[PDB]
């Protein structure tokens, strides 16, 4: 009656994990932290096929593309930092005084003028040099100063030519694998997606390294989206995706120099040196009204999970490192750490601009590795910066004695959640082209 | 090449069986260089494993191959209409994955092996 | 192995068609180790792409394969003598490369696909 028939090319897939190569246009330059050793050129025709009558189970919280991106970004940081100047002769005693230049009261003590002995191109001669160092980079040797990492880690200067500006990268699957995109606009990243397509590569994802705020990310199409591995678990971060972005205006007003010091036979140390004009605090402005309407939308969407009559409180971070207690980020080449206590300070009952002070740092341990730190060279001129706040990473306060109110604070640190906000709609699947089915046909 | 790839994934199995070449053409194309090379090599040997499976049956160089293995109603008792006009290949795979290895074993146990031996012998008379 | 490789490149197409195996045998065999491995892997997947193209037509395991695609005089209006006794394969490729993709599309569009489906159906009666 019926016989086994073998079909090859059958459209069937399974869940699997694989290594995804990265496509990138990579135009310009004639010096990129990422697309120079790992990724490859883009695709002129990005082809997306809508899989009709297809409902597919997605899970952004068990997506191996996020882990692959984490490993790739860390490795690419390390590779970019490998061929640069090692700053081991700068772990010496530093004689430091306060800056005599005109300094605002807020910036008093933040910057130190430090004189020290350094190596020259000739190993038998020493030079007396001086440099400006931020107070967050400088530890007193006793109750004479020293850099912060000298006790724990060796320091490597970042190559000034290499730029820290994120460029989009598309994650593409090899042959025999596919990337399924969830096209549902209300999708919270877990469960069945009815509107599915297949793509060669993901969209252009800028590897933006930041805490407490998702800058230059994608925007929700319809409404603010609240996503969490377990919304009832306070230990799990809450990813908030905006539908309209909030513009953020960051700047370091100091007109800065970059003094070159020949530390070795061909090695250069780029210190700050001097500031032309007045000295003022670096800061970030956001619109008060825009932030108000965005927080109102976030509260409206949080009340879906936490009840309609509950009071939603926004408070600043409870504690941690400077990376997680502040909106830490990097644009213009310098590393900002901005106090978001003015962003999150509200109580929403169920019924102009904000200026965030920012502190700059030059010694950074980005991924908390042991025995490795980076010196960020100073940038010549005045650095300004404009970005779209497109989301938040929040943490709900646990152990609440009062059941009527819920408190949410900024969070971050683990950047796997920064790119979970981008890779939530993608899923790697594995084509099983061989099928067997009954047909009336019989081999002779 | 990529056009129509998996487009009939939600089609019926009968309708998706007319698009097998779009899904068959798409199975063949520093540390990251090693990663890309490992991906390419894995794809190649996977494709070759599938082609070897097709070839140890009578299905070499064929995307549809009729066999001499009878269908057992212990694997699926649906009539052809439910399979080829009401169901999709993903649902069919979910239903039949528990017996797939038995079916493969039967495909290479007796039919192709005894067929080949019998054609060895029929080329004598 | 390498003997006679491309020796009939300047021969007529008819005469060069008797030497296809010398050019078919020759398609299969630190940072520089990665370079050699990339070359070998590329050769392998290229050979497999060509074999897949042959197999999605009826031309699997064949160096000469007759098809059911008619010749269109919009691709070349020469008579067999000009092609197989006066021209070489390089000149023919230069002449016919603009239509090659149309010919490949026709080879896998209807003839092998409808043939296979019709043999699926002829194995019922």
């Amino acid at each position, epitope marked *: 009656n019926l016989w086994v*028939t073998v079909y090859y090319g059958v459209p069937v897939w399974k869940d699997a994990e694989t290594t995804l190569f990265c496509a990138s246009d990579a135009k310009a330059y004639e010096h990129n932290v990422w697309a120079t050793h790992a990724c490859v050129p883009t695709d002129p025709n990005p082809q997306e096929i809508h899989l009709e009558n297809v409902t597919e189970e997605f899970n952004m919280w068990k997506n191996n593309m996020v882990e692959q991106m984490h490993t790739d970004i860390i490795s690419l940081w390390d590779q970019s930092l490998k061929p640069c100047v090692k700053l081991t002769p700068l772990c010496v005693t530093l004689q430091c005084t306060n800056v005599t230049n005109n300094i605002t009261d807020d910036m008093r003590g933040e910057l130190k003028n430090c004189s020290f002995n350094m190596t020259t191109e000739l190993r038998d001669k020493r030079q007396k040099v001086h440099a400006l160092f931020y107070k967050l980079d400088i530890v007193p040797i006793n109750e004479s100063y020293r850099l912060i990492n000298c006790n724990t880690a060796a320091i490597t200067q970042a190559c000034p030519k290499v730029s820290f500006e994120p460029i989009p990268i598309h994650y593409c699957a090899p042959a025999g694998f596919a990337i399924l995109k969830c096209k549902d606009k209300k999708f919270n990243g877990t469960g069945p997606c009815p509107s599915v397509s297949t793509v060669q590569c993901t969209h252009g994802i800028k590897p933006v390294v930041s805490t407490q705020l998702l800058l230059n990310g994608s925007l929700a199409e319809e409404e603010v989206m609240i996503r969490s591995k377990d919304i009832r678990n306070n230990a799990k971060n809450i990813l908030v995706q905006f539908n309209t972005p909030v513009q953020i205006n960051c700047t370091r007003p100091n007109n800065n120099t970059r003094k070159s010091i020949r530390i070795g036979p061909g090695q250069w140390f780029y210190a700050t040196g001097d500031i032309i004009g007045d000295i003022r605090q670096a800061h970030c402005n956001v619109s008060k009204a825009t932030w108000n309407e965005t927080l109102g939308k976030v509260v409206k969407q949080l009340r879906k999970h936490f009840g309609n009559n509950t009071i939603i409180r926004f408070a600043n971070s409870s504690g941690g490192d400077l990376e997680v207690t502040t909106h830490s980020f990097n644009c213009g080449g310098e590393f900002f750490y901005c106090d978001t206590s003015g962003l999150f300070n509200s109580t929403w009952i169920s019924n102009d601009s904000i200026t965030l002070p920012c502190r700059i740092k030059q010694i950074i341990n980005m991924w908390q590795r042991i025995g490795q730190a980076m010196y960020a060279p100073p940038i010549q001129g005045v650095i300004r910066c404009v970005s779209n706040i497109t989301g938040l990473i929040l943490t709900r306060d646990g152990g609440s004695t009062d059941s009527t109110t819920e408190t949410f604070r900024p969070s971050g640190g683990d950047m796997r959640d920064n790119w979970r906000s981008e890779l939530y709609k993608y899923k790697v699947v594995k084509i099983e082209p061989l099928g067997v089915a009954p*047909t*009336r*046909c019989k081999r002779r | 090449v990529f056009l129509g790839f998996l487009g009939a994934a939600g089609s019926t*199995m*009968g309708a998706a*069986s007319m698009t097998l070449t779009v899904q068959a053409r798409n199975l063949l194309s520093t540390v990251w260089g090693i990663k890309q090379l490992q991906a390419r090599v894995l794809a190649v040997e996977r494709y070759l494993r599938d082609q070897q499976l097709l070839g140890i049956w009578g299905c070499s160089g064929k995307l549809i191959c*009729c066999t001499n293995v009878p269908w057992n109603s212990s694997w699926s008792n649906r*009539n*052809l*209409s439910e*399979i*080829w*006009d009401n169901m999709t290949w993903l649902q069919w795979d979910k239903e039949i994955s528990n017996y797939t290895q038995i079916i493969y074993g039967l495909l290479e146990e007796s039919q192709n092996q005894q067929e080949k031996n019998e054609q060895d012998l029929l080329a004598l008379d | 192995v390498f003997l006679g490789f491309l020796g009939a490149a300047g021969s007529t197409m008819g005469a060069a068609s008797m030497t296809l195996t010398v050019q078919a045998r020759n398609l299969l065999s630190t940072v520089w180790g990665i370079k050699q491995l990339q070359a070998r892997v590329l050769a392998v997947e290229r050979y497999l792409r060509d074999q897949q193209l042959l197999g999605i037509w009826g031309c699997s395991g064949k160096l000469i394969c007759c098809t059911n695609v008619p010749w269109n005089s919009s691709w070349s209006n020469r008579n067999l003598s000009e092609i197989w006794d006066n021209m070489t394969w390089l000149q023919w490729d230069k002449e016919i490369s603009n239509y090659t993709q149309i010919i490949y599309g026709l080879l896998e569009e209807s003839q092998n696909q*409808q043939e296979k*489906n*019709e043999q*699926d*159906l*002829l*194995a*019922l*009666d």
Partner: nanobody
Amino acid sequence: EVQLVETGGGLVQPGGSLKLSCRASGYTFSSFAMSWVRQAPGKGLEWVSLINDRGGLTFYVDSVKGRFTISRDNSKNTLSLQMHSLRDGDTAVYYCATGGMSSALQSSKYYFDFWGQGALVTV
């Protein structure tokens, strides 16, 4: 609801030619194999020809193998039977019917389910 109407039956001289046509409605034409079956006036039914659902496979009885040609157009829902070198034995009422075979992905339909009216051919 199924309807199969034959047009083209008439008078033709011996050795002539004739194209019968059958227009179908009320069902999916492209999902059915078609057949031509003739009955001479005083005699019984005789199977003439058969064509599959896609129109690629054509089968004939040996008496008309080189002379008759069955074809179909699924876009137009038409079934054609071209007849050449007509002999005296081809005088009959020709019926177009649905069935005769089926695809491998369908149950066996070795029977003629829905018949047409008829078209009288006289030689």
